[PDB]
Design a protein around this ligand. Structure first.
Ligand SMILES: CC[C@H](C)[C@H]1C(=O)N(Cc2cccc3ccccc23)C[C@@H]2N(C(=O)NCCCC(F)(F)F)CCC(=O)N12
Ligand SMILES: CC[C@H](C)[C@H]1C(=O)N(Cc2cccc3ccccc23)C[C@@H]2N(C(=O)NCCCC(F)(F)F)CCC(=O)N12
Ligand SMILES: CC[C@H](C)[C@H]1C(=O)N(Cc2cccc3ccccc23)C[C@@H]2N(C(=O)NCCCC(F)(F)F)CCC(=O)N12
Ligand SMILES: CC[C@H](C)[C@H]1C(=O)N(Cc2cccc3ccccc23)C[C@@H]2N(C(=O)NCCCC(F)(F)F)CCC(=O)N12
Ligand SMILES: CC[C@H](C)[C@H]1C(=O)N(Cc2cccc3ccccc23)C[C@@H]2N(C(=O)NCCCC(F)(F)F)CCC(=O)N12
Ligand SMILES: CC[C@H](C)[C@H]1C(=O)N(Cc2cccc3ccccc23)C[C@@H]2N(C(=O)NCCCC(F)(F)F)CCC(=O)N12
Ligand SMILES: CC[C@H](C)[C@H]1C(=O)N(Cc2cccc3ccccc23)C[C@@H]2N(C(=O)NCCCC(F)(F)F)CCC(=O)N12
Ligand SMILES: CC[C@H](C)[C@H]1C(=O)N(Cc2cccc3ccccc23)C[C@@H]2N(C(=O)NCCCC(F)(F)F)CCC(=O)N12
Ligand SMILES: CC[C@H](C)[C@H]1C(=O)N(Cc2cccc3ccccc23)C[C@@H]2N(C(=O)NCCCC(F)(F)F)CCC(=O)N12
Ligand SMILES: [Mg+2]
Lengths: 171, 172, 173, 170, 171, 171, 170, 169, 170
């Protein structure tokens, strides 16, 4: 049951420029997030957008659709990891505007990922290049890390280049 | 949960700005909704461009062709935008946008390969060959060869092939 | 999800205000009743102004198709039929039943008159279909019978030659 | 089942009461977090009341709510009615000091009913959070969490999970 | 349903030339019955075969397959209606050797029948001709009777030409 | 569904060189029929094999597997249509040894048929050539007939070249 | 599906050195085929083994398990395609003893293929090398052909090196 | 349908071949253990051949088979055909030294696809078993088991999981 | 698929080995009890071997097997392979003193995972008394240990009195 304010709660957050990326990312979630990003951009192409991320991952092309839209719009995008960002969720976290990528202290971050053979490898290489661009790590290090079935703490994710700030309280 | 803006749900709000969404598998229900939206936008103005957002793995051939024919029939220019993917019938719709107005974002994947009686399935397949030839400007022989290859193309390859005009990282 | 336009219409209701009725998907009793109710509404708004009938359907229940057919004939309005995607089985009967001169298809549509209760009753219904197609296409009963046994689709051009429709348009005239 | 006019829960939300009920998963956590952000923007000083009746749920979803409670500036009064087990008892214990309550017949459990290394890392995060808010040593928290049992409100007060056991308002 | 052994009980009855046509008649039942008729014929093409019929009907082509095999073999076939013979069941009852078609006293018999249109009519006309042949009634009378949704007593079925003898006790 | 004796009636028929092709033809049915044809062949490569066919059709490649095995073995094969032979069932009926293709009088026979596009057409053309070979009709006539959604009587199927003899009683 | 007896019919065929590879190839099918190959080898390591193949394909590692066992045993193995051999089925067909790979005239043969990303590519490359070895075609030609979604006639498969003989009669 | 000659697996059992196929659960473990006890009583000296084609399964069921292999006196030749992942690769590695084999196209994975403390205790038992049979350090075993990947037979030989990669006898 | 030699379990039964595997319900208990009666009538002196690999099960079904083990005159050697949890560990502990074994990697749990309230407590107290009798620990220590949600290694189970011998080899 989604509560209302006199607007359902998510719509109310949307009016304050907060977009929620929650649960598994599929085509339906991607389209909704993209539609919300277009809406916020037309209200103002300068004011920051806040992206709340609590997700175990999802479909690669759906994640990439959101990724490309984030890059395409002019707005700065602050990413916030609460709970977890695994697989495509961690890619979206890392794709926030430099300096504006955040996690709360107990979140868990995973870049490991839990079609023809050639196509699955082409998509995998696209992920390598995107993580390399945003984290500043080499392709070899990205590949090694993505093969490891383990989560990182927020501090480790900061050291790796996935995020900028680990906040307990506002600054 | 579909979010609302103030009462419009997010897609209806996009529709008021002349953006139509073609998302997920294309069946008769999706085709009818898209067609109804195209008729609405045309009556508001038969000159102002229409934006078509495409993120689809494909679908039913006749439903795809219904949308295709309606796109051609209306007078408006139609800008097509590939985000995520356009496979099978999705890539046909992408290619059918107004010349010069067919776009993809940088990490999209495009497939023209295709994943009721035998004679009828071949007749539909030949209709697809002729439509791709018209809009890509490639020969029928090249279309037939390419459609037999089970693979995706990058946006740059799709541009070289004639499926789209522009690969944009940021607006122009 | 059906989109809305603003004073709140869903998109099909908005099309209905412009005299467009949609016959989409399989035709059953529920679809027939909705289409019939819409035809009665449009008639009372004006019994002279044309009605546009959008048809994209693989067919359906014979008596439900016949209910829509009879209502189309009964109202006074001219009815323009438009085949987009496909009109198979009962869908092609409705297409053929539009006002003469006002039956249209877009260029890539597919049209089928082949059809994919006690034995005597199924034959009686089949003969009613033969007579309706004969009336509207102007073909003989023998030719209708032969054609309906062939499991195939027709292009819009072939359907025009056969008498199912009048005009194949790429763009408005 | 939900009575109308605007449902009862939205009406409670207008009085700064947030409900954490049933199993805690990602969907529940997101709703609770969204409500906490709403109440904070209405006023970052006025207290928030958190009603907790829950058998527990997903660890990361519980931790997401925990972190948001700490992050906002408001004081948060926690109220245990019925039960607070597993992640539910962590949220109860995480209320503002002096403002953690239970009604008299509630049951409280800190026992907990992914790769091996990851389940242990999450378990150690829970140990440190309970130690911080209860003021008990890590060794005592670990021992208590291995015992499959519930505590009465009085026992939970003695342990440091809550501050007040009320039969009637003060 | 546990089948008792002595051979299972149906196999034991088969060794004494008794074939059972029970329940709905589909392709599987028809094949079984046909296989049994071929077996009994090879043991002796002169000795009578007893066919026990208790059936609400079934698939027309499967019924016709059994019918044609009954006619094809040389043996006399005694048909016995116990419980009921409806639709295709009553056709098989009527198709027994003349003089050898029986019912017990409380059985119920129905000739009413509870693919493209043209094909269903062609099959229906094949049924008309078969009933006319074995009952000795006109085609017009068969067609009228088959439109009536009702059962007949054994005595009425005897008068109509579906069977020869209604026995309470052996003769 | 209970077969009678375990040593069922179908195995007993197999010992007399009768193979049953019943119900929908899929890979499992084709393999069983093929295995039985190999068995009968090794018992004697001269003695005829009887193939009982009551089938609404099935998978094209499974039908073709049985077809090719029938041609490959050296035995004469008598085909018998009881009930119906539709789609791939009618192909098997037509593929019996010339002069040895039979139907009982009330059977129904259909040649109409109720993967990439190019592949479905290649298989369809293989069916055209097989029917042309065994019926002696032209490719154009086969193609026209297979588009018509209808059944044929045994007499019509005889005239068309699908079978040789329509028997009410043995010769 | 009732299996007839004489021995069930497949066991009877096994006594004449005929092994059946039918339907989708999974771990259960592979283990049965492997067990049968070990049995026939111990009866005689010289007498040929006949392998009947009618299969749309299946699990790659299960197909490779059968492949490796075929190579490992000393017996000559005659492969017979009836109906179809697609994906892993066509690999087994091609892996028969040279000169002893057969198809009946109306069979259809497909080498196109209808886990982490790196692992699926490693398995795909193992398939390329196996087809190259047994067909005598270059790796580049195998890779190009496997990307085309289409079937080959028995004659085309013979020309390609997948089989040696297309027989209408024994 | 399992063919008869004995069903085919029973026939292989009479030649001292035991099959460990598909997912390993309690039912599979009990059957394998029962077969190992049978073969041991026929002769406690003659080798036993263990065919392994398995994606893994339940840890305690794998450990039950492991302990029984060690407990009996017989030499045990392990054979990887198709794959040995997770608990399957542990059983492969637990064969008698010098008698651990793979065919050339097999895939081998030591990565693994109840309370928190208990899952770690079981994990540490696996670390010590792999260390014993491969001769690698505990630190290297731990690192390798976190990597979600398969090894070729040659890599598995270099790592100490098996002794011989044979194309032909 | 159960192999034949007798199916393999029946063959083991002829050598006085009874298998208690998987979840223990009424059906399993009745089969085990029937086997114990059979072995007893063959000889009331010769030992019986009980193989235990079980996560637990229904309390009354476990108690039925327990009572029958005590009732017959034979010595009973218990063998834990894989695991013995809940009712499984009770049966392990109930073997003849000196004849209770585990292999080295087994896991043993006496905690119960996760009828009127009074009845569930009566059954729980029956378990306390049975464990006290066979382990020789005080009932207070049994009750405390059974509240801890954890497994024991074979060595710890030996120290606790659950079993007598941890063997790597005969
Ligand atoms: C960043 C958007 C730029 C400026 C631009 C443009 O690139 N596209 C194409 C487009 C179309 C569809 C999906 C897309 C997804 C990602 C990127 C581009 C997409 C349409 C958009 N429009 C709106 O946003 N209109 C107002 C939005 C308010 C609303 F309420 F509708 F949300 C129409 C006017 C327009 O110029 N653009
Ligand atoms: C391109 C449409 C042209 C101009 C034309 C015409 O071809 N058709 C027929 C038609 C009917 C039904 C479905 C069709 C699908 C594809 C193409 C044509 C279809 C109806 C339309 N009308 C409306 O659009 N009316 C306003 C509708 C929009 C709104 F939502 F706003 F109400 C009525 C005035 C009219 O003649 N035409
Ligand atoms: C062609 C309709 C004529 C004129 C006539 C008539 O035959 N019937 C009977 C009738 C009843 C019900 C279903 C029918 C289906 C098919 C044919 C006739 C049916 C009702 C109709 N009415 C309306 O439609 N009234 C306006 C309603 C407008 C609204 F907006 F509400 F839809 C009431 C005035 C009236 O006498 N007739
Ligand atoms: C404690 C929140 C601080 C103050 C701060 C901030 O860090 N985030 C980031 C953020 C984003 C998304 C999820 C988060 C979860 C936990 C913590 C931070 C999260 C958004 C917030 N905003 C609002 O809530 N604005 C008022 C609107 C609230 C209402 F519900 F009414 F819409 C936008 C301006 C702003 O400063 N912040
Ligand atoms: C009445 C049967 C006649 C005499 C004749 C004949 O037409 N067919 C063909 C046939 C084949 C298959 C199904 C048929 C169905 C209906 C009619 C004929 C059918 C087989 C039979 N055979 C047996 O039954 N042989 C003895 C076997 C006895 C057994 F116990 F096994 F059933 C083979 C030798 C033979 O001459 N015929
Ligand atoms: C007509 C078959 C010829 C003669 C020949 C041959 O082509 N194959 C290959 C083959 C193998 C597998 C499936 C096949 C399907 C279609 C065609 C050929 C097939 C094996 C057969 N054998 C048997 O049938 N042996 C008798 C055993 C029969 C029984 F059931 F009783 F066990 C082994 C000796 C032999 O020469 N051939
Ligand atoms: C080609 C097998 C060779 C010759 C060799 C050998 O490598 N293995 C190991 C082995 C074990 C298990 C699966 C295997 C799969 C593929 C390859 C090897 C496999 C067992 C076999 N044995 C038997 O087959 N014994 C007779 C069995 C006959 C029966 F009828 F029972 F099946 C035992 C002694 C022996 O020399 N080998
Ligand atoms: C290697 C077993 C040793 C030698 C010894 C022993 O430790 N156990 C205990 C035991 C019991 C139950 C399961 C066990 C699982 C793993 C390890 C030990 C197990 C019983 C076994 N027996 C048999 O195997 N008997 C022959 C069986 C032959 C048959 F054909 F039936 F399978 C009874 C005579 C005997 O000395 N032992
Ligand atoms: C420990 C059993 C004692 C000795 C005694 C006795 O108490 N009961 C009663 C009884 C009955 C049923 C279940 C029981 C379960 C637990 C305890 C007692 C049970 C029957 C048994 N009998 C057998 O076992 N007879 C030989 C059996 C041979 C067979 F192979 F079939 F098992 C009949 C003669 C007899 O003296 N008793
Ligand atoms: Mg005793």
């Amino acid at each position: 049951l989604i509560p209302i304010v006199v607007y359902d709660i998510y719509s109310r957050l949307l009016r304050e420029r907060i977009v929620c990326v929650m649960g598994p990312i599929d085509d339906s979630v991607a389209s909704l997030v993209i539609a919300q990003l277009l809406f916020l951009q037309s209200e103002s192409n300068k004011k920051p957008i806040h992206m709340y991320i609590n997700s175990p991952g999802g479909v690669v092309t759906a994640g990439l659709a959101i990724y490309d839209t984030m890059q395409y719009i002019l707005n700065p995008i602050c990413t916030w990891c609460v709970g977890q960002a695994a697989s495509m969720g961690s890619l979206l976290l890392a794709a926030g505007t430099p300096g504006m990528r955040h996690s709360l202290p107990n979140s868990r971050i995973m870049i490991h990922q839990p079609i023809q053979a050639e196509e699955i490898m082409k998509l995998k290489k696209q992920l390598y290049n995107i993580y390399a661009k945003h984290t500043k790590q080499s392709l070899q290090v990205i590949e090694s890390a993505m093969e490891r079935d383990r989560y990182m703490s927020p501090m480790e994710a900061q050291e790796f280049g996935i995020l900028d700030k680990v906040l307990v309280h506002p600054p």
